[PDB]
Amino acid sequence: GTIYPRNPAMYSEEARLKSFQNWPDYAHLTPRELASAGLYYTGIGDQVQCFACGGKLKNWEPGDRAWSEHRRHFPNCFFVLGR
């Protein structure tokens, strides 16, 4: 195909959700919201990554939403643009 995910295994939303097993207790966004926005946990801090574009986000702030931060930083991601 003409696009290709940075992480094919994390193609699955269920696989992304499982990655949050050890999501830290101070990290306020839910695994559900993050995984739905294409994001999985990298295992470091509160840093997540998109399976599609490969963009990484950290240092989440109160009021942040997963989709709006994903689209603001990585607007040309195929997952963002396919939503």
Binding site: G55, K56, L57, K58, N59, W60, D64, H73, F74
Partner: peptide, 4 residues
């Protein structure tokens, strides 16, 4: 959030 910030991009890495």
């Amino acid at each position: 959030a910030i991009a890495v």
